[PDB]
Amino acid sequence: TLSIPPSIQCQTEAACRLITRVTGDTLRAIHLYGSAVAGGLKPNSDIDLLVTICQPLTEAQRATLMQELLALSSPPGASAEKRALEVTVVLYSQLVPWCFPPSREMQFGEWLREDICQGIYEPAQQDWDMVLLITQILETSIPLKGERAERLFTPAPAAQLLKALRYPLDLWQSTADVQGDEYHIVLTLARIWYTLSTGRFTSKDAAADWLLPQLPEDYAATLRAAQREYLGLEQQDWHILLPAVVRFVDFAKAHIPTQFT
Numbered sequence: 411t412l413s414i415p416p417s418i419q420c421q422t423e424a425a426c427r428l429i430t431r432v433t434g435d436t437l438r439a440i441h442l443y444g445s446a447v448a449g450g451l452k453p454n455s456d457i458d459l460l461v462t463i464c465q466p467l468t469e470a471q472r473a474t475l476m477q478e479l480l481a482l483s484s485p486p487g488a489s490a491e492k493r494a495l496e497v498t499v500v501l502y503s504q505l506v507p508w509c510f511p512p513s514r515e516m517q518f519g520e521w522l523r524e525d526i527c528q529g530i531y532e533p534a535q536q537d538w539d540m541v542l543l544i545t546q547i548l549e550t551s552i553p554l555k556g557e558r559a560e561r562l563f564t565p566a567p568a569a570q571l572l573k574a575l576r577y578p579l580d581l582w583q584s585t586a587d588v589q590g591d592e593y594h595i596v597l598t599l600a601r602i603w604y605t606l607s608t609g610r611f612t613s614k615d616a617a618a619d620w621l622l623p624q625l626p627e628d629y630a631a632t633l634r635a636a637q638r639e640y641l642g643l644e645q646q647d648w649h650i651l652l653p654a655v656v657r658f659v660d661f662a663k664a665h666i667p668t669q670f671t
């Protein structure tokens with residue numbers, strides 16, 4: 411059975427207790443997933459949590475949850491003992507049976523700290539990534555509360571998983587679309603490519619390793635720089651590298667499979 415890294419156990423139990431208390435009667439399950447469970451937990455890595463609830467959260471619960479999580483989470487890399495939390499909240503009725511795309515009730519994350527610390531909360535909204543989240547959780551997750559994933563959710567049809575995997579390819583078309591987030595986008599494309607070719611999910615680092623031998627050397631060099639930075643082995647000047655990142659994004663759009671291999 412999958413294990414929680416000892417070094418995040420205390421904070422993970424604190425998040426679970428806070429979520430449980432605030433949601434109360436409406437809570438159906440809490441699952442830990444992502445690199446803490448699947449592998450590749452780096453110093454900057456967040457703690458990924460999915461919260462399944464039965465009824466929508468009141469305007470008051472949402473505010474309580476957001477403000478409290480703010481105090482349970484720290485910006486990534488700030489502390490080795492207090493990681494960034496990502497908490498995604500979803501109605502059970504959006505997943506069983508599936509709505510495509512599913513909506514998420516709310517998402518807490520450090521990239522939203524400046525808004526969340528002012529009381530500005532993203533509202534419920536459609537999110538194709540929820541299909542990827544549940545698919546990943548069905549394979550690799552730990553139920554902190556409620557039932558194990560394979561007993562709670564059902565897999566999405568392959569056709570919808572395909573649409574969800576390819577949807578972010580339209581997010582990146584311009585230079586400004588990718589500027590500021592360069593290595594993240596390069597590694598995500600590597601993972602998307604990996605999943606479409608194998609049907610499987612793997613870490614950012616392993617996805618880069620898998621893709622590198624299949625690339626012309628110019629594109630492997632960009633992927634290598636992105637992997638290197640993510641592993642903390644070298645910080646590049648990504649303004650200088652931006653034109654090559656745009657070429658890499660275009661190369662992935664041209665070459666990533668359009669159907670599962």
Ligand SMILES: Nc1ncnc2c1ncn2[C@@H]1O[C@H](COP(=O)(O)OP(=O)(O)OP(=O)(O)O)[C@@H](O)[C@H]1O
Binds near residue numbers: 443539542612
């Ligand atoms: N093919 C894919 N495989 C995995 N994640 C993918 C893929 N395509 C898109 N993603 C999305 O990218 C995000 C990855 O989340 P996250 O950054 O927490 O990754 P991680 O594996 O936990 O690594 P880290 O340790 O850097 O947090 C999720 O929203 C996930 O659904």
Ligand SMILES: [Cl-]
Binds near residue numbers: 449450451
């Ligand atoms: Cl690890």
Ligand SMILES: [Mg+2]
Binds near residue numbers: 444445446456457458
């Ligand atoms: Mg993560």
Ligand SMILES: [Mg+2]
Binds near residue numbers: 444456457458496
């Ligand atoms: Mg995350």
